[PDB]
Amino acid sequence: NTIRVIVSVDKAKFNPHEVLGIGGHIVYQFKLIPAVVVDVPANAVGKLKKMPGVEKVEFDHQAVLLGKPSWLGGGSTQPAQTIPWGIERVKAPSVWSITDGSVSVIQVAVLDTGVDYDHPDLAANIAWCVSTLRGKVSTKLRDCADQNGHGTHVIGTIAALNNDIGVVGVAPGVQIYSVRVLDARGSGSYSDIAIGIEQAILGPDGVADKDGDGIIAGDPDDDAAEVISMSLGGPADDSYLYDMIIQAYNAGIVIVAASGNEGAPSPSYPAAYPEVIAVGAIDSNDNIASFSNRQPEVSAPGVDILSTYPDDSYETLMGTAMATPHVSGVVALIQAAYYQKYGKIAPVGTFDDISKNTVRGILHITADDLGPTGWDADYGYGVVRAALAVQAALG
Ligand SMILES: [Ca+2]
Ligand SMILES: [Ca+2]
Ligand SMILES: [Ca+2]
Ligand SMILES: [Ca+2]
Ligand SMILES: [Ca+2]
Ligand SMILES: [Ca+2]
């Protein structure tokens, strides 16, 4: 009988009781942007628009996961640790002796279906679990656990442990925050995904900048993530969500997102935003996958990708969702190594960037440039390479 909407407001004029008085419900008041997620009856949407302090009324759109089980491969047919082909393709393993991600100030937030937080090849890296489903922020593990599989697979491509079992991530020492914004079927509301972005900025302690110095990502006094990774996509561009992507970007957080799997001519949202790295998928032959949405920023392995899967298991998945965490891994290695040497993180940088002084510039100039020379609509700048990116970072 009610509909979910996201109102952008003037905080000094807006009275939430007025929503309540028209038979509405306050779902979530954002700490970092001037907006509130509310449920209202249909009849009331008109009233909302007129109420004092309400500047925009946006409806709640849907995004979905961007990984599916592979047509080809299977599980980890081997009790030893396997290095999935993708981890090698992005030249991660040689980097680990310089850093594997385990620099204390670095956390990577993965906004997905949740995580199997007990998985033996993941657990020691899972630093915090949260769920924002239906706009209720929960840190009960039973609410944060993965009921799909996809988030556990994505998290394993970034950070599965480097040991003698399972698989291994691009950044196998990096601390992960699993932020569950998608349900058991892989579907999520934009309102929950924006709440998840907020949570990755706030971190475990619920405060963005606890010491007031204006540094959030790359402040060891705070517990903000440095990378937000979204292996998901929807078709709408909404102002409140972009407002949140901007808060994370201004916080110094690198945001990375799947381009989409529809062979479409451009990326889905939030990948399509300027402030987000859109990632396409290649296969084990260096061909762009036919399903990969075009004009990404970079590309990475996304076909026939073995990783962790719930109940202490392993599965082979495909999609731009699988490509995304390879790039999130590489970004974590860049920021870890950058901080380890300089005692701060590097700036995020722009889509455009070709300087060795920003994360995005480094990723671009060190990518393996495939297909047409330079940036192209299939590969973007090319396949990310961690070993070269770290060398560029420290140079
Ligand atoms: Ca392992
Ligand atoms: Ca915090
Ligand atoms: Ca701070
Ligand atoms: Ca500080
Ligand atoms: Ca941090
Ligand atoms: Ca090219």
UniProtKB/Swiss-Prot annotation:
Entry note: thermal dependence: Thermostable. Highly active at 80 degrees Celsius.
Cofactor: Ca(2+)
Catalytic residue positions: 112 (charge relay system), 150 (charge relay system), 321 (charge relay system)
Keyword Hydrolase applies: yes
Enzymatic class: hydrolase
Proregion residues excised on maturation: 1-79
Domain Peptidase S8 intervals: 84-390
SUPFAM superfamilies reported for this sequence: Protease propeptides/inhibitors, Subtilisin-like
GO annotation terms (biological process): proteolysis
Keyword field: Calcium, Hydrolase, Protease, Secreted, Serine protease, Signal, Zymogen
pH dependence text: Optimum pH is 9.5.
Localization in the cell: Secreted
Enzyme Commission code: 3.4.21.-
InterPro entries: Peptidase_S8/S53_dom, Peptidase_S8/S53_dom_sf, Peptidase_S8/S53_subtilisin, Peptidase_S8_Asp-AS, Peptidase_S8_Ser-AS, Peptidase_S8_subtilisin-rel, S8pro/Inhibitor_I9_sf, Subtilisin_Carlsberg-like
GO molecular function terms listed in the Swiss-Prot or TrEMBL record: identical protein binding; serine-type endopeptidase activity
Cellular component aspect of the GO annotation: extracellular region
Job description of the protein: Has a broad substrate specificity with a slight preference to large hydrophobic amino acid residues at the P1 position.
SUBUNIT field: Monomer.
Family the entry assigns: Belongs to the peptidase S8 family.
Protein name: Tk-subtilisin
Species whose genome carries this gene: Thermococcus kodakarensis (strain ATCC BAA-918 / JCM 12380 / KOD1)
Organism lineage string: Archaea, Methanobacteriati, Methanobacteriota, Thermococci, Thermococcales
